[PDB]
């Protein structure tokens, strides 16, 4: 076979230990999922510094906690915009999931609260910037560099999917680089606890699996498709289904045809053809062997999965950090003062937040 006796037994034991880890992680998650935290701070506890990124419902700002002086990233959502965009359920998903998960590559939620106008989620500040910026600046990542990041996403999805959580918005814009060069996944706005199928048409066009575009009930395998898109974009510098307008992007995705740069290794192309697989009976991550089809693929042969989890692998890139609260690794955005009404808006819709 491919593995000798020693290698086979080591791999088997490793895979059993994964099951043991995930069973304990589920027990811990369920305790927090059934008894969530709420109202752990208030707005006047923080000084607002600078906008770090924007979204449809608001922005994320660097804030400084007045009492402790610690810096945080505060996501601000305008309740009125959330209701109009039918994102009430999604925003409740985001907060509930973030408060209950625990993994080295998932951003940590520290506080959450609401006022008359807005919802607030206060997270650890990750100063190294978005992967997106670094990728666009350099052009592309070499295969070992891309593989280091991809391995962290594989482990993060193995964790999330074991908890019946689908992520649904993988892309470089949502992956921050920490002070050690490791990934922090942010933006749980589309994450959802799903036992089997779900039906919402949501995500980012370039990263959507064909079954989403085709209005099928879909499952966690959409995240494994998106991993294929991410790995391709990291290694090529552009995604595999690339067009100016969403309708044109969707047409390319459902055709299934993928072309690869001549510099892609054959191992990489083989992995990507198995992730970017339109037939769900053949897509890696959706088969009997589960995540192991990905983790044991030749492209990951040099990956020490435990060492990645333990953050003991030397990172390919360490962001420059000029001190606590430095924002040099983030782009600039138009600033807008946070307005808080004298009247409570959308109170009944956000009671559980």
């Amino acid at each position: 076979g491919h593995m000798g006796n020693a290698a086979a037994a080591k791999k088997g034991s490793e895979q059993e230990s994964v099951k043991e880890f995930l069973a304990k992680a589920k027990e811990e998650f369920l305790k927090k999922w059934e008894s969530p935290s709420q109202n752990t701070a208030q707005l006047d506890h923080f000084d607002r510094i600078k906008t770090l990124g924007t979204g449809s419902f608001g922005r994320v700002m660097l804030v400084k906690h007045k009492e402790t002086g610690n810096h945080y990233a505060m996501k601000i959502l305008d309740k009125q915009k959330v209701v109009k965009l039918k994102q009430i359920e999604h925003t409740l998903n985001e907060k509930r999931i973030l408060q209950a998960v625990n993994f080295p590559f998932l951003v940590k939620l520290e506080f959450s609260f609401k006022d008359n106008s807005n919802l607030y989620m206060v997270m650890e500040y990750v100063p190294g910037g978005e992967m997106f910026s670094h990728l666009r600046r350099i052009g592309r990542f070499s295969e070992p560099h891309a593989r280091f990041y991809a391995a962290q996403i594989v482990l993060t999805f193995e964790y999330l999917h074991s908890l019946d959580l689908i992520y649904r918005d993988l892309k470089p814009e949502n992956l921050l680089i920490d002070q050690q060069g490791y990934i922090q996944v942010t933006d749980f706005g589309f994450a959802k606890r799903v036992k089997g199928r779900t039906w919402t048409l949501c995500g980012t066009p370039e990263y959507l699996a064909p079954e989403i575009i085709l209005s099928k009930g879909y499952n966690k395998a959409v995240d494994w498709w998106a991993l294929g898109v991410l790995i391709y974009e990291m290694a090529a510098g552009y995604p595999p289904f690339f067009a100016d307008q969403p309708i044109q992007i969707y047409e390319k995705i459902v055709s299934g045809k993928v072309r690869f740069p001549s510099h892609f290794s054959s191992d990489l192309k083989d992995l990507l053809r198995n992730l970017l697989q339109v037939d769900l009976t053949k897509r890696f991550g959706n088969l009997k062997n589960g995540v192991n089809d990905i983790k044991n693929h030749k492209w990951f042969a040099t990956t020490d999965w435990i060492a990645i989890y333990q953050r003991k692998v030397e990172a390919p890139f360490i962001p420059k950090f000029k001190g606590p609260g430095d924002t040099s690794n983030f782009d600039d955005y138009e600033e807008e003062e946070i307005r808080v009404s004298i009247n409570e808006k959308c109170g009944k819709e956000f009671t559980e937040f």
């Binding site: 449809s56 039918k86 589309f190 048409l201 980012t204 370039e206 067009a243």
Partner: peptide, 13 residues
């Protein structure tokens, strides 16, 4: 040709 700037999520169709 395609989109090189930051890409916003979509909530429907």
């Amino acid at each position: 040709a395609g989109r090189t700037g930051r890409r916003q999520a979509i909530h429907d169709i």
